[PDB]
């Protein structure tokens, strides 16, 4: 699945929909990052740029210009062809092929952007421009405009507002398309799969990164490169850390592992946590925690639907786990005192949903406290946990458990789709999955 | 194969060494850098910090201070211990703890940094700093000079002079020790593994970037989790690019494919190309270019040892590629004439051999034109090519065919050792290797 | 005459007015600047500042917070009480006193800024900023605005909307109220008196500086400290040179000496030029060039009022300079093809008149090519002037005579009053007044 | 009075004579800044590239090349001529006639300086410079070294070595040469005439600010233009302000006057400072703190030699302050005693002594706590100061009397020359002045 052509120029016009007439809306590429010396990170693209373009190139930038209630149009700014930079560096798309290939109505070389934009903007009313982003962007923009107000002797004249696009794009963003909704199926298949693949290569003696190497290899196979965010690999106390990347040690007979890891494909992140045993069974101990994570997660997943908020589940889930920690011994006391004085903090102690989407930590507003009521469109994880510390003053059976399940969910009209249920989660389906790998 | 914390004590005395009495040389961590919004690409230390205490951590600076010809002292600014940031994170060294794992005199949390580098800067002559290469770096000590230069009415003074540390260490990472021979070794060794892996596994109808998910977890499988670089997948006329990255399109039947890549293990880079047939089989076109390139590595490989240099070596190569393309048509002419005017450089565009370490591009000096006189321990690249573009004005069997091969070596007393000889080059090798997959 | 109380306070609500609702305009003081290592120049606030507070202290931000279209209020930023800091350096306001003194509702101290100001714009629609005027307020506005958007945890929302406020406040400051005009009576009474009193001082053998010294005096005298702008004192030759501050060289027998200058009082500009013979008697060939200067001024006068325009004027300025200078044999041709060729440019190559205010230069929108139609109000000053240069390819009695006239007016309901006329201009009457002083 | 050129060539020489051979030493005009909108302050040249040059214009760039230890060269980077910009702001030296006005080898336009400094720095091993003054001058030095690392592949390479020149400028300038007392001398003339004047203008009714009117206007009448620093005018409770400036107030009859005023000649600071009584008569109790003051300065100016110190001196200043402060009742105890707690402090809280050049807080390494020992030509102000605040808990009288008295000297072979002695300072001499200028 992939999003079309049709589907970036739809963005843009709705964008250009909200702009008041006498307007223009600028929108920056990401900056090329070095990673040692001479050599850089692979491009990742600004998420907002992208939205809107699709198109991967540094040095690049994309510029709506609404006129009027009828007239407007799109002008790119982006690399110009050079034979030489090309066949050191990559082909470009250039001037030329960008109007047809991008669905825009000029290209401009980037090279000649601050002798143009000034004069894509003289005379305009408004700005839209998300300040403070990158630098590099917040120069250009800054320059254009002390043009235009330095310049009343040459008939230049500045826009006096300057509007942040970002409230309203990553409200867009908040809301997928039926497009959207698919590729991000296919990149929560796709993680599905590697997490199903490291439950399967998992024996004692493999170290963390093992795992990680196995869940990007079925990354790339499927076409997604690149993860979304840094693989977590977490055995034994190491699930207790909650982004642990270092993913270093060798993982023991008896211990639990916490693989956090998701691809990026077509833009789009998958984010899956899976926790399992790593010799295929889980110890009495492991397996009671496990339960009250699972029950968390089996709840939202029901619980989700339009009307309801992540506080409101978050809810039902910290009753969930606040009676499990009671029975185990974990926690002493009466259940909705404990409740009230938050007494699952120090065991469940970040949020049960984030948005996902072009970000794994997506953009769109939550509310206060994350009460924001759900609309269908909305995509969203569920990954309750419960982290019991190695030193922590419960009974001794349950230090060092750190178990975190994690899924991805779009809102529909009448629940949710869960998009990564094809990786099991069921303590019994994980074991056979496992003890059958071994044979 | 790994560095033990001795060496890294050893690199801090010859650094110390050759510092004067009353100075103090900084050395300061890579920042984080964000690949979209809050998320992080995976860390990746500065190589020279790297290269003075095998330490992965941000937010950390080594400071060395020379007192004077007896008298040294190292203090290291890193992370504190916080049980919700590392509960969040990852696990942090601290104070307590990097003195001893480190091998430094004295640790500070780095968050003091502005209030305690001035005082250790105090009355000393020299500071050495790498200016400009980090932006927060240089805030930091500008701050601390300012401070000092200010301060007089509390008996502070600023160090005059500011000496660039870099050349000398830069030369020091040039000649590697027995120590980073061997990591090197390995590294060599694990990217050979894994470009043999994507020779026996390549078929047409595959995807270029399947062959670098073959590479990438090959690497992995040797404990070697990150590539020193961006791997390239160029088949067809993919290959005429030399730093194509896209590696987006169908493997062809009858198309090469050109496969730069290289793990980075212990934070030492390994840099293999191989060029071979997407089907197993070089047609005969495919194979002329290929002797050609494969002549040079292998006469280059021959001649490199102390006394030599790469511009001599190459001089010799540039010889061999214009005699090959004259006896193909691809080049007219008398051949000393074309190599007088260079005609090989439509074809032969990049250098023969760079230097490899901490960096894949390592550092040091290279003299002008690479003319500088070759001694044991430096370690190289050796990456002839030839690029046929898919409209030169070229019979039209040659056009597309973009052919790299390249090997590392150490050289040694006697010549070079070959670090990535484990994975085949040879045209029937290649052929030979493909089938038995 | 002075700005008062009430007038800073209806500059304060007219802005609002102006304003959306759930909104905060933002308006930095000037920062100090270095003269030399550890002294600063004398300080002078910046002009938007002090036009809605009257207060001349660095370290201090206006916020004006309309909350809604009726409930508004003041929160002023500005540097604390400090026992030490001002037996050193002066008497601070600070923060009890600021209320009553300047008229706000509040007032924090200034160090706490970077503490309080985001929580002054939490939630708000729209920030009014002029960005790009000062790099330190650039820093504060940005780091607030930062704060506020990664801050939704703490529920912080930032404005989306960052609106410059300075087109509306410099089309406020383009109008000058009755006490404004009366301000800038007095700036234009007290520069003539100094320009007045430089011709009946000037001898030769005096170097240009003293005329600068006479002047700066006078200024001083009336109570106006500061000079608008640096004053400008060409003789011989240096008169061509139109923003000529070197003031350097001796003032000679036979030469015209040329003075620009003008006083700051209570922030607003004089801006007065005379042009007068150093011996105090023009010869025939400079008083052949200063009375067409002195017809473009005196005709400039007549003509200024509401429903014509600086550009308007211009045109009739150029028309009676190129027939001037024809008569003289300085330009050769018809005259209306001169005019179409532009061949007044090489003597006449700058405006006729600019806008006068809290700055010389003053703020407000000309139009194209200074086309805008004048209204009462508006405050101008007029400025002709001829330069031939010691080389230009003319009658050789007229090379290296610079000369420039200049009033203020401002404009009125049937035409305009003349700020500046208390210093003479007419040539008998400069050689009449430099006769009387001798006489001393 | 003037510095010669053959001195401006010798200052050059001197900071040559200096440097490490395969260097460059780069110095950097002031900046102009703005005073408001488009208005600019009058321009005041960096007093260490003035020191070097005698050139009154921004936009430039000194640097000198030491090649080895015979062969050596200067480059000035400075505006071109352009007839326009001339005509409308002022006569440019230029490119052609630099060389033989400033005494360089070779002038270059300061618009090629990023393509050009590069290239004087090419293959040399240190480079001079003073960084973190100005911040236009650190990005041209940093680009121009930026260009030399990264240029190998171009033959290029950047000094590795780049060192503060102004510990030894500023040596260089604690030192005066005769031709820089001659003007110093010439300075403090002017600034003495001008507080003569004042006190022969002062009567009750003015303004603070008509003294400075005064005071400016003399300076202006003998050639010195501007001021070294911000007049101070303090009448009254104002005298009690150290660096009083608003000098916004209407002197009374019974009030002192503090003037503390000096002028710029040729870059040279004079800094004077004289209280006196706005009626022309001193009160017994303004004599008696008058008399404390003026014993500290003539007693400073008597000790004041080669071999003692500015440390050494304030001591002897501080004992004569506490001794006059005890037999006035204005402190209460044992001399020795109070001189040990510093009592003298609420009352005297500033130094007695600073460098003077053409900085009025001059250049120069004053040593802990001002103990270096003084040689011939270091110039330094004497300002003793007695300030009783009007809420001080001591006699009634004395409240609100605020004093200074400040002359400059130079220290020759056998102890100090004043340079301001020609305004007077004994209480009977003001009286008599004043009372002549009445009559
Ligand atoms: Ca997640
Ligand atoms: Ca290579
Ligand atoms: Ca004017
Ligand atoms: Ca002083
Ligand atoms: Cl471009
Ligand atoms: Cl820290
Ligand atoms: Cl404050
Ligand atoms: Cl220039």
């Keep these: 699945s992939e999003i079309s052509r049709q589907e970036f120029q739809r963005r843009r016009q709705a964008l250009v929909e909200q702009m008041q007439p006498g307007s223009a809306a600028l929108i920056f590429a990401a900056p090329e990052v070095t990673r040692s010396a001479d050599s850089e990170y692979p491009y990742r693209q600004n998420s907002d740029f992208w939205y809107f373009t699709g198109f991967n190139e540094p040095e690049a ?59 894509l903007l003289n005379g305009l009313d408004v700005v ?45 963003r908040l809301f997928k398309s039926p497009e959207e909704i698919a590729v991000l199926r296919r990149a929560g298949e796709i993680t599905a799969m590697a997490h199903t693949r490291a439950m ?10 093992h795992l990680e190497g196995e869940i990007h290899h079925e990354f790339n196979r499927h076409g997604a490169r690149y993860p979304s965010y840094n693989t977590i690999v977490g055995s034994g106390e190491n699930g207790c850390i909650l982004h642990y990347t270092e993913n270093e040690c060798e993982m023991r007979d ?32 492991q397996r009671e925690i496990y339960d009250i994570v699972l029950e968390s997660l089996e709840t939202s997943l029901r619980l989700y639907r339009p009307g309801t ?5 978050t809810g039902e889930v910290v009753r969930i786990m606040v009676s499990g920690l009671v029975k185990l011994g974990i926690l002493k006391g009466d259940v909705d005192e404990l409740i009230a004085q938050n007494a699952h903090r120090p065991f469940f102690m970040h949020g049960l949903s984030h948005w996902l989407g072009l970000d794994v930590h997506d953009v ?45 969910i779009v809102i529909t009209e009448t629940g949710n789709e869960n998009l990564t249920a094809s990786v099991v989660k069921k303590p019994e389906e994980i074991e056979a999955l496992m003890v059958a790998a071994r044979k």
Tied chains: 1, 4.
């Design 309 to 313: 908020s992540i506080l409101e589940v």
């Design 128 to 172: 839209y421009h998300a300040q403070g982003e990158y630098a590099y962007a917040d120069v250009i923009v800054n320059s254009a405009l002390e043009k235009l107000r330095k310049g009343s002797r040459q008939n230049l004249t500045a826009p006096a507002t300057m509007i942040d696009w970002r409230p309203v794009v990553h409200e867009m």
């Design 61 to 119: 930038v994309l510029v709506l210009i609404k006129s009027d209630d009828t007239h407007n149009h799109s002008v790119l700014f982006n690399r110009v062809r050079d034979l030489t930079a090309e066949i050191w560096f990559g082909r470009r798309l250039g001037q030329d092929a960008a109007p047809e290939k991008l669905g825009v109505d000029r290209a401009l070389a980037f090279s000649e952007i601050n002798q143009q934009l000034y004069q």
């Design 200 to 209: 399967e290569k998992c024996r004692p003696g493999m170290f963390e990164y």
């Design 364 to 408: 769109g507003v939550y509310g206060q406290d994350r009460s924001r009521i759900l609309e269908p469109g909305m995509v969203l994880t569920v990954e309750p946990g419960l982290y019991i510390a190695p030193d922590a003053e419960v009974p001794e059976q349950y230090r060092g458990i750190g178990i975190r399940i994690e899924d991805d």
């Design 254 to 285: 008896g211990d639990l592992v916490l693989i956090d890891a998701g691809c990026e494909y077509k833009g789009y992140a998958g984010d899956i946590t899976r926790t399992f045993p790593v010799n295929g069974k889980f110890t009495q101990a």
